[PDB]
């Protein structure tokens, strides 16, 4: 039980860190009426798939 719980905690922490890093990298692009840099769009998936 201890090992399983620790593994789940670590994997959740890593997933949260990835999501937060994505949000922090793509936050400034929704504060401008500009383009999303398809180069960055491919690597960093965002909610706008085709629009904007």
């Amino acid at each position: 039980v201890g090992m399983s719980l620790l593994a789940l905690i670590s994997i959740f922490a890593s997933c949260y860190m990835l999501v937060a890093a994505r949000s922090k990298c793509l936050t400034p692009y929704a504060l401008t009426p500009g383009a999303a840099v398809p180069w960055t769009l491919g690597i960093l998936c965002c909610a706008p798939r085709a629009h904007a």
Binding site: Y29, A30, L31, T32, P33, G34
Partner: protein, 161 residues
């Protein structure tokens, strides 16, 4: 002529924010994005604009959302060029010198955050947050734009209006 055009744009593109019955700030429609400073708290005095989902970023102190389809024609147009000179404002004229926005009279008042600073052609350049009292003048802590980047300019001693 320029004053009338600027006021006409301001009537159709600026909305007061209501909180506890007292005005705290303004939300403006620039391009296709709703604008609002983050530190200003309240709700937009508009049923349609109140239900939008806002993306918050405390690094730049701004909250933005996608404007509804039926208000797209009643929104201002923007630019990213800032030549040296003077620019219009609802409270008069602002002096732009050396990358700084300065209020000649120091007439800024708390609760006026969210009022865009306009260009000579009626385009929006930046969104004000607060002002720092430098002697008889008052420098503006303002949120401006590069070609595709937002930058937050904050002079020392700025107070969030």
């Amino acid at each position: 002529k320029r004053e009338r055009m600027c006021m006409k744009i301001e009537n159709d593109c600026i909305f007061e924010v209501k909180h506890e019955g007292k005005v705290t700030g303004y939300a403006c429609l620039v391009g296709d994005k709703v604008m609002k400073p983050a530190h200003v708290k309240g709700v937009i005095d508009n049923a349609d604009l109140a239900k939008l989902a806002f993306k918050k970023s405390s690094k730049y102190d701004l909250e933005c959302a996608q404007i509804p389809v039926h208000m797209r024609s009643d929104a201002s147009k923007y630019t990213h060029e800032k030549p040296e000179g003077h620019y219009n404002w609802h409270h008069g004229a602002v002096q732009y010198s050396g990358g700084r926005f300065t209020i000649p009279t120091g007439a800024g008042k708390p609760g006026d955050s969210g009022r865009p600073i306009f260009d000579n052609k009626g385009r929006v350049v930046a969104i004000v947050l607060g002002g720092a009292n430098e002697g008889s003048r008052t420098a503006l802590s303002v949120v401006t734009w590069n070609k595709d980047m937002v930058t937050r300019v904050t002079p020392e001693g700025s107070e969030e209006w």
